Symmetry: C2
Subunit: 203 residues, 2 copies
């Protein structure tokens, strides 16, 4: 049914805007302050290894949102959404690199986070984030990791509800095919879990 | 490990405020306009069967947030959160009633939603829902149904990370025990036809 379909389309759009907006707030709010200042317990190399490949994800997602926004204001998003994805999907390797750095990124965060002074700086930077949703760093760094499975979810349900008479349908299928290829998120979730909880018992 | 714990505490608090705030926006923004406007295509009985037991959930959750907020400003939420739950968990039966009505609520929504005029009213009301995330109706009506599992999640993780020297620990255990009882009822429903 058309109106169920519309909902999914709107959810994807609304969670994308949300996602890109959050990402810009982590760059503007955390990354940039660290690279400008608070230098002592937060060396640039440590900070950069933490954020490596994040602007890269923001970049391609911001372009995806742009095209999605272009279509929506023209009242043609339901019918050409897979057009927006066709520019996006082949830029995905960025997601591979980001995912690929998550183990390292987290190892450096946890090392930094031994410093009490460092923690205070981070808590300070957070208190300057806009909105009521002032999330901690991890809660931003994880978002690219979380996006992919949501795409899978969203696109699966949208395809199931898209007739073959939609010209856009193959474009959605291509997208789900390539997005699904990044099912290694589970490996990433697992390894992030272990590192975060390694030192319940001892180290 | 203490700082992992702090996170969960803060997530619960932040998702509660979010939750109660969303709920007030559904009452103020959808329910109240429908009941005042008295549209032919949205009669009170239909509307009320749809929203039945929702204000009741808002009420007890708003009191939970109150107490959580009281504790936070006093810098003592980490350590007395299960105190806040102590007033809440026994008021849960309203969650039973709300859950219990979901089949009916949704049946009436889907019947209403045959009317093109009805859908336009709803889309109009939404346009006036505040903020970027002006959600549709079902996205509000489902939130109580989603809350319970998150409590279970969050409390399970918080207990696991709370040593026995915390005086509040039994209070968290009580809560998980009773919330678990209601989370048994949480299942899925069909996109038939």
């Amino acid at each position: 049914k058309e109106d169920y379909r519309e909902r999914i389309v709107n959810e994807m759009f609304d969670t994308e805007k949300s996602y890109v907006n959050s990402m810009e707030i982590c760059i503007k709010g955390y990354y940039e302050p660290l690279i400008q200042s608070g230098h002592s317990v937060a060396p640039a190399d440590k900070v950069n290894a933490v954020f490596l490949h994040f602007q890269s994800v923001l970049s391609i997602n911001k372009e995806l949102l742009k095209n999605m926004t272009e279509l929506k204001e023209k009242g043609e998003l339901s019918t050409r959404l897979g057009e927006a994805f066709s520019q996006f999907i082949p830029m995905m390797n960025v997601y591979k690199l980001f995912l690929g750095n998550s183990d390292t990124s987290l190892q450096f965060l946890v090392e930094l986070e031994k410093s009490s002074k460092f923690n205070d700086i981070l808590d300070l930077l957070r208190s300057h984030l806009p909105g009521d949703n002032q999330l901690d760093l991890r809660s931003y760094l994880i978002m690219p990791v979380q996006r992919l499975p949501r795409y899978k979810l969203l696109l699966t349900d949208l395809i199931k509800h898209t007739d073959d008479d939609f010209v856009d349908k193959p474009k959605l299928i291509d997208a789900l095919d390539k997005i699904s290829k990044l099912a290694t998120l589970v490996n990433e979730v697992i390894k992030e879990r272990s590192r975060n909880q390694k030192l319940l018992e001892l180290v």
